Symmetry: D2
Subunit: 289 residues, 4 copies
């Protein structure tokens, strides 16, 4: 067995040794260590070529990695972390919750600010209401195009296809969804219209009615990704995002007690996720380039 | 300024008095008291006489307060399913909103029971906290569901039905035809149910597999988006009672009951397991006014 | 096995049936049900006469019940709940944390108020600073008497003996510690001087030095209570209070994940404890009178 | 107003830059950044030159900032024991405060290791979260401890020593005589340790049993009360770093790191497991200034 032992700062500030020593530190530090091993196993599996027997828009690899996250993390600076992974094709499918799309898009038009625990407060973050007004103006012409394409070109819209379209339109390398569509990484979000984006789609529908967003074609798409995977890796940030995974890491502060080798790290992902990425995907950056 | 004071058991045990004294006990007990006041205000507003079905596209008549009841699926797996069913049965709320699993966990309880365990896969058991759902429950549900999905596809392609999650949930409640079901009562009383995440869990798995045996089902969320937002927009007053987190995204009255934290990102929040608190809340509010409904 | 089933309000508001139905409701409601059974088992054991073989200031019963609680609950209205139990000899030993003594005593001099989440805020409670000034005035002459008794009568003070003395002095039936000393229920609290009471003892010690509070005699006293018990019941509210129990109920919101048939109810005790007492000790009130 | 922005890994991996970017990431990452600023301010104040041992009754010289380091015993069972030991070893803090178990869990690690398990009684194992302490560790500690307690009683009754928890902790650290021990370094560097709850756990069990074999030990808390309060009162400036809850009851700088909640009842709180956060905090603060100490 492994002895409990924390990093000894008499050795100086050796950051890599420090991060490795979380594994033997105990409690959630140990879980962070296990999360690093689990994600490195997904990456190692993913970079392993498909054998001649295992062969199949996005090409299949030896490990399909699903990255899920709640909207709050897209409001946070973890948006940059997720965008980096998507940009370099390190994950294959994104899943998110109400708000998780528009909050990325809105940051390309106006910044989010730090406050404290016309303003939309999200934890200690501040989104001025003018951000959402700018977003409305940008969005409306796109929605007119989408309804026209539905009615005159037989386009059958789903949340994922809509998200891809919004990513193409924002046309900005800081956007998670710009990179997702450019790299053919599908984004699933049945709760896409539950928040502000949904409010705008709602008002738009009275000037220009009939937009259909089907979730059943998306249901087929996401499940086929899971079913045809050689191996599956899950990285889920925050709770309430998804409902067998060969590798899995969950990072959230949800409790089990009210009913709400897989690894759970009980921590705010805003602290843990960048450290996790530093020791995993960022070490194998060239292999993905 | 109210003094802190707890119920004195030298009075004996009067449960009404015990529950009222939560108000002056402090911490979440006080929030519970504030939640009772807030829900009672909703009810009183709902009951006071009103002195556009085209705009709402709904058959349910407007009252002076539209109450939205939101809840996570785990609460339906629990006995809070009975609490919710009762409110729905007697038309005490106007709109339901739930999360992935929140529909099928109710319907499956009509076919077979959920059991109490403790805080599995080789025996075929889906654990939800200290609750146990045998996998055979889901198999029974699947068999029940398939022919209904067949009818739904046929009605869509030949009777022009445009399905959405809410219309599906209504159909499933009518089909289950069982007075213990939330969704049976909801459709009977024209209380719509919204759940964009309807297909994220087991029910979705079954719909997915069904779609290869019988392709064609479309579930539109935009028509539901209009229905739920028109309910809010054309309300005279709105009340919100939301159990667990992540259900909904101005409300004149609002009560939230959950144990989610604020730190990783007058409305009343009670920081508590709704399985304890919600039946106490119902007892001191809706259940006191049963006659008026 | 037991089927999950919540209370059905079509039966009307039958409070006792409602409380019983928590047992089959699931999650923490089920734990509340288990807590009720566990505490009723302690009480039943306690009211059972000592057999002729089992015989021993406080007389031993068939079950010694330890009631522990954090200071915050004494600031809350749960102070009334605890006081009721102590008043009628339903528990045998109290254990508490820093502040848990003085907050009871101070309420006999001035009230605590409700605020929101010169004022000492405790959660959503408010203690005006003038409360602590009144307490200081009341306390100083008592501390002079205590030092005199130590030096001229050989009194060897410990936290428990001090707490008993303060309870006798407050001489008020609303006080937990008045009833504890009257009924010979010892109160243990090594952290007695960590807060405001300690601040006053500290300043007092420069006008009138030499007060000794020994924790070792208390160590012996509390452990002997545990060792000589026929049966032991633990009821612990909040975390960090104590460190084999035949019956045990813990009510707190502490998590396991950072390392901080016994039953744990994960809930604010301000909600749960009065309901627990209603269905347990309060049902057997006459047997204790 | 600072814009929300996370570390961009297109820069590659610079750990200093990564940790600085926590400040602008939001939620607890931002609090971490604020914690680094706050601790760095303490250190800078401590290091700036000072231009009453009678009143404190202490041998440790005053600096321009007295830093109190508080921590719960579970952190000593973890590897954070090493982090704390390092700070104590290099005199970077002035006063330690801990909770029941916080002394013996350090001393026992000098006799035998704590192991990693997972989140027992028949094998003889005390589980602390995902940590495992074999019961034999406590037996070894007991045997080591008894003759020291004998000496302590004799010194009390014949050399007039007036024992308190802090003086006991110092004696135990001197006896363990091992540079991996927090308490060894604390006594060597005249950093006092306060723990009124010293006897609530295993160490107390042993003291209790010892007291029948060799009666007479007195542990006074009032003399410790004076010592700790005089440290605070005669500080030029005070800094507080408190890990886990329930340790202490004006501070010029204060950082708290724990996962306790406010709901059942500029200082910086980081809502996080200190096993993750504290080594990162130390890396960006005290460990950057090692030379100055
Ligand atoms: C972990 C994944 C690979 C599998 C599970 C299977 N129950 N699954 C699939 C369906 C689904 C959706 C969904 C539904 C409809 C449209 N778009 C998105 C969102 S989360 C989720 C989900 O968990
Ligand atoms: C609190 C309500 C009255 C208003 C808010 C407005 N942002 N709103 C409406 C849209 C919506 C949905 C939705 C979306 C699409 C289909 N079906 C359901 C689920 S929750 C939610 C939600 O919060
Ligand atoms: C559960 C009880 C019956 C047993 C445990 C045994 N480790 N125990 C006893 C010692 C003790 C104290 C203590 C210490 C010194 C003076 N006064 C109070 C406070 S809590 C506690 C504690 O948990
Ligand atoms: C934050 C400090 C500098 C000040 C506060 C003042 N209320 N204070 C001092 C007394 C004290 C103890 C104490 C008590 C007796 C013996 N030994 C230790 C433990 S924590 C604590 C505590 O918070």
């Amino acid at each position: 067995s492994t002895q409990v032992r924390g990093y000894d700062f008499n050795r100086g500030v050796n950051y890599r040794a420090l991060l490795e020593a979380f594994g033997t530190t105990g409690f959630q530090a140990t879980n962070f260590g296990r999360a690093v091993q689990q994600v490195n196993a997904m990456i190692e599996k993913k970079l392993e070529p498909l054998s001649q027997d295992e062969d199949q828009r996005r090409p299949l690899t030896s490990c399909t990695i699903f990255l899920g996250y709640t909207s709050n993390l897209i409001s946070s600076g973890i948006r940059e972390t997720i965008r980096y992974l998507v940009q370099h094709n390190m994950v294959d499918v994104l899943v998110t919750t109400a708000g998780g799309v528009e909050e990325d898009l809105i940051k390309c038009l106006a910044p989010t600010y730090l406050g404290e625990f016309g303003i939309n407060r999200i934890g200690n973050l501040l989104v001025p209401n003018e951000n959402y007004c700018k977003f409305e103006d940008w969005l409306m012409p796109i929605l007119d195009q989408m309804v026209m394409e539905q009615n005159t070109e037989g386009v059958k819209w789903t949340p994922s296809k809509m998200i891809a379209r919004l990513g193409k339109e924002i046309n900005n390398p800081e956007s998670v969804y710009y990179w997702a569509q450019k790299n053919h990484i599908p984004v699933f979000s049945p709760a896409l219209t539950d928040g502000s984006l949904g409010d705008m789609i709602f008002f738009h529908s009275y000037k220009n009615p009939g937009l259909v967003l089907d979730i059943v074609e998306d249901l087929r798409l996401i499940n086929t990704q899971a079913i045809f995977a050689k191996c599956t890796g899950m990285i889920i940030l925050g709770g309430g995002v998804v409902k067998g995974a060969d590798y899995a890491v969950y990072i959230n502060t949800a409790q089990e007690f009210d009913g709400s080798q897989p690894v759970k790290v009980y921590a705010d992902a805003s602290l843990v996720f960048p450290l996790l990425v530093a020791e995993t995907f960022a070490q194998k950056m060239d292999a993905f380039m």
